[PDB]
Amino acid sequence: APPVITPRGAPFEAVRVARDVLHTSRTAALATLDPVSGYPYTTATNIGIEPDGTPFFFAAGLTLHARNMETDARISVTLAPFGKGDALTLPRLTLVGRADRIGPDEVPLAIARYIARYPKAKLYLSLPDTRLYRLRTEGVQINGNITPADLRTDLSGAEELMAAAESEATRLNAIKGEASRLAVLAGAKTGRWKITSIDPDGIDLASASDLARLWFAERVETLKQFEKALAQL
Amino acid sequence: VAPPVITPRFEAVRVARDVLHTSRTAALATLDPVSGYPYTTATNIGIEPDGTPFFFAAGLTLHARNMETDARISVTLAPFGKGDALTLPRLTLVGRADRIGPDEVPLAIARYIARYPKAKLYLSLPDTRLYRLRTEGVQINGSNITPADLRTDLSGAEELMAAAESEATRLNAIKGEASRLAVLAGAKTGRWKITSIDPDGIDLASASDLARLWFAERVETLKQFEKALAQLLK
Numbered sequence: 001a002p003p004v005i006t007p008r009g010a011p012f013e014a015v016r017v018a019r020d021v022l023h024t025s026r027t028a029a030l031a032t033l034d035p036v037s038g039y040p041y042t043t044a045t046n047i048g049i050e051p052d053g054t055p056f057f058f059a060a061g062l063t064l065h066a067r068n069m070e071t072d073a074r075i076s077v078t079l080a081p082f083g084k085g086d087a088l089t090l091p092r093l094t095l096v097g098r099a100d101r102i103g104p105d106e107v108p109l110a111i112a113r114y115i116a117r118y119p120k121a122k123l124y125l126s127l128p129d130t131r132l133y134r135l136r137t138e139g140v141q142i143n144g145n146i147t148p149a150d151l152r153t154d155l156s157g158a159e160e161l162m163a164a165a166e167s168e169a170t171r172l173n174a175i176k177g178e179a180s181r182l183a184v185l186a187g188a189k190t191g192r193w194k195i196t197s198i199d200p201d202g203i204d205l206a207s208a209s210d211l212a213r214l215w216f217a218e219r220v221e222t223l224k225q226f227e228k229a230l231a232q233l
Numbered sequence: 234v235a236p237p238v239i240t241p242r243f244e245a246v247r248v249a250r251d252v253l254h255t256s257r258t259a260a261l262a263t264l265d266p267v268s269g270y271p272y273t274t275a276t277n278i279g280i281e282p283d284g285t286p287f288f289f290a291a292g293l294t295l296h297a298r299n300m301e302t303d304a305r306i307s308v309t310l311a312p313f314g315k316g317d318a319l320t321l322p323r324l325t326l327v328g329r330a331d332r333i334g335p336d337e338v339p340l341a342i343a344r345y346i347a348r349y350p351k352a353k354l355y356l357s358l359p360d361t362r363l364y365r366l367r368t369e370g371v372q373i374n375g376s377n378i379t380p381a382d383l384r385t386d387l388s389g390a391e392e393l394m395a396a397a398e399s400e401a402t403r404l405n406a407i408k409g410e411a412s413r414l415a416v417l418a419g420a421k422t423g424r425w426k427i428t429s430i431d432p433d434g435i436d437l438a439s440a441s442d443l444a445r446l447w448f449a450e451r452v453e454t455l456k457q458f459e460k461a462l463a464q465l466l467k
Contacts, residue, residue, distance in 0.1 A: 029260030
């Protein structure tokens with residue numbers, strides 16, 4: 001199996017900037033392959049990130065990029081602060097792999113997850129041609145030794161936290177000012193924030209315009225360990 | 234004999250030309266020579282007087298490499314600063330990455346720097362490569378548009394084009410004038426400069442934003458430009 005990115009472990013530093021970009025990028029460039037011309041074909045879309053770290057996204061069925069992906073699952077995305085300043089002076093995370101359509105048995109949860117981050121997607125996720133896809137990342141490049149494995153969150157020791165994750169995010173979001181003080185502790189501006197996802201390594205938060213992630217000092221596997229981590233931060 | 238570069242599935246052309254002229258950041262897709270997978274990056278967009286997008290890539294990068302091996306590329310331009318991707322108009326241009334020849338790099342540098350002042354540094358780095366998009370297919374999003382629809386026709390306007398550089402300089406020397414034009418264009422006040430004048434209008438840049446002011450009618454001569462400008466600035 002040739003590497004999906006032809007060449008021209010990674011240390012904590014490199015991986016952490018890569019994971020920050022993964023979790024705090026709203027806009028993704030998406031490239032697909034045209035089924036007859038062989039040319040690439042790009043669009044831009046919103047990215048969601050499943051608790052295990054897997055990127056996912058919406059594409060309407062009537063689109064050229066959806067069409068392209070039905071035939072050929074080979075795709076690439078770039079996550080970057082698109083529009084925040086000179087693109088060549090800012091991080092660029094590229095993820096190359098296969099687009100897997102989220103099947104009917106799994107779309108309700110994927111819709112839920114996507115809305116948790118993007119409440120305004122309410123207006124397009126219950127359409128006749130609504131489709132969502134997961135990226136199965138196969139090669140990774142970051143611009144300023146990283147593997148697909150480097151970018152995943154390991155859930156395996158943490159089923160108790162994950163059973164409580166959604167309830168806990170609801171609880172915390174219902175504490176006035178709580179999501180925003182978490183956003184600021186993460187390094188974000190104070191604003192209108194919501195927790196969108198809790199996982200063993202930290203908390204993803206979203207405002208109307210920005211994203212943040214608060215990283216735990218140490219891995220959290222239980223509800224009690226969660227409570228302790230919050231009490232430092 | 235060659236098939237459309239995009240296999241087929243609000244005024245399209247005007248919205249498209251506006252995105253074309255006012256987008257800083259572009260998604261760029263390239264093809265991997267071995268795996269056949271696409272490969273994406275983000276890059277900055279320059280525009281030439283006829284509307285042709287151009288861009289720079291460091292030579293020691295994967296996309297630069299990919300483009301050496303196979304020139305077929307795609308770019309998506311959007312007003313990305315303005316909020317979520319699925320809310321924005323998104324212009325996809327499919328075609329070939331043509332390397333800009335040696336004689337034209339000095340001009341392309343100055344044009345690029347005008348939009349991207351930090352480039353003053355990273356273009357001064359080894360193996361800088363310069364490309365323009367040869368557009369072969371177009372999609373606008375968020376119709377049935379052709380590459381020709383996006384281009385600005387310079388025929389008949391050689392007099393204006395012979396003066397366009399010194400007119401930009403002239404106008405940029407009138408304190409506040411580029412910013413007045415940018416506000417007419419629908420933009421926010423700031424430290425604006427005219428980057429380009431063409432028969433159909435004027436491109437402007439500030440540090441955070443880009444603007445395009447459209448003429449009410451096509452301009453071919455200096456007399457016609459000055460009249461058009463005087464009407465506008467009333």
